[PDB]
Ligand binder design. Structure first.
Ligand SMILES: CC(C)([C@H](NC(=O)c1ccc(C#CC#CCCO)cc1)C(=O)NO)S(C)(=O)=O
Ligand SMILES: [Mg+2]
Length: 299
């Protein structure tokens, strides 16, 4: 009976998965491996000689059209946000993500398969304190009517509001206080509208997309035969995307995020503004899990 530091976590065992890239349609082999303390999440292109390694950090984000992409020179890793959301939701600090192709596999469009594979392998607590980024001041970015904000909050909470001119919503808004990740949002799938598909595919985007890995919406209806997993699956997926984009900070957050029609580009603009404003955040640890504002599942 004593105080217990909240510790960094990595994988207990290797995870292997095969899939297809949502936007490239390429077949890709994925391997998640444990990593030492303070490594962070690092993506490794193992189809290249030499292997190119890209830390999953805000400073390495290149394009943010359709998905969050990591770049180093001529080498990219596309669509990292759903896997990163699973890592953040489960509290994984350190891991190598090996990919045989430029895009993370889409799986079923959600973080569900990733959390299942990770939790089946199990997590391993490590002998070093977990570092948190605590929001100390309000930080806001806007572009037009889009908005993304960090607010101080003793915990971790994400709110999101979207406005789509579309019958399938019959405004969607949701707030989640991390209730917890596996239950609340992990299973929420990405979505696409048929009105955009021919244009997107002409741009070598959405080439792997299908009803097997996305909610496909036409003029009026969801086309997936078995429908939605949640009444508010769309905005729940926006929250999933935000959690993964925010994990590009490299540490879990103590604070609140509020998104208003935000997406990957504005999310990354928010992280860059936050990092530059060192008055607005500090790195903290917790030597006694009992007085911390966050708690994590058993490993
Ligand atoms: C929701 C987004 C934030 C983004 N999703 C996409 O990009 C996406 C997803 C699915 C399809 C499809 C299909 C099909 C079909 C049927 C056969 O042609 C196309 C695009 C995302 O989840 N990023 O993390 S989006 C678009 O609002 O930016
Ligand atoms: Mg998404």
């Amino acid at each position: 009976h004593h105080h217990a530091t909240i510790k960094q976590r990595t994988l207990k065992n290797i995870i292997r998965a095969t899939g297809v890239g949502l936007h490239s349609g390429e077949k890709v082999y994925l391997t998640l491996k444990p990593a030492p303390v303070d490594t962070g999440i690092v993506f490794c292109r193992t189809d290249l000689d030499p292997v190119v390694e890209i830390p999953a950090r805000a400073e390495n984000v290149g394009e943010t059209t359709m998905s969050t992409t990591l770049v180093k020179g001529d080498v990219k890793v596309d669509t990292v946000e759903h896997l990163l959301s699973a890592m953040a939701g489960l509290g994984i600090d350190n891991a190598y993500v090996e990919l045989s192709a430029s895009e993370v596999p889409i799986m079923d469009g959600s973080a569900g398969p990733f959390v299942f594979l990770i939790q089946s392998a199990g997590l391993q607590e490590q002998e070093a304190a977990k570092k948190f980024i605590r929001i100390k001041r309000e930080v806001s970015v806007e572009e037009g009517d889009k908005r993304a904000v960090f607010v101080p909050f003793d915990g971790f909470k994400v709110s999101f509001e979207i406005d789509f001119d579309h019958p399938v919503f019959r405004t969607q808004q949701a707030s989640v206080d991390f209730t917890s990740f596996v239950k609340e949002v992990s299973r929420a799938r990405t979505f696409g509208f048929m009105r955009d598909i021919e244009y997107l595919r002409s741009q070598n985007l959405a080439l792997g997309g299908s009803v097997e890995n996305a909610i496909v919406v036409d003029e009026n209806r969801v086309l997936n035969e078995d429908g939605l997993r949640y009444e508010d699956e769309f905005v729940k997926h926006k929250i999933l995307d935000a959690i993964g984009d925010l994990y590009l900070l490299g540490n879990s957050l103590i604070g609140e995020f509020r998104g208003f029609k935000s997406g990957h580009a504005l999310n990354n603009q928010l992280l860059r503004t936050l990092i530059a404003d060192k008055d607005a955040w500090e790195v903290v640890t917790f030597e006694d899990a009992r007085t911390a504002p966050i708690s994590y599942m058993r490993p």
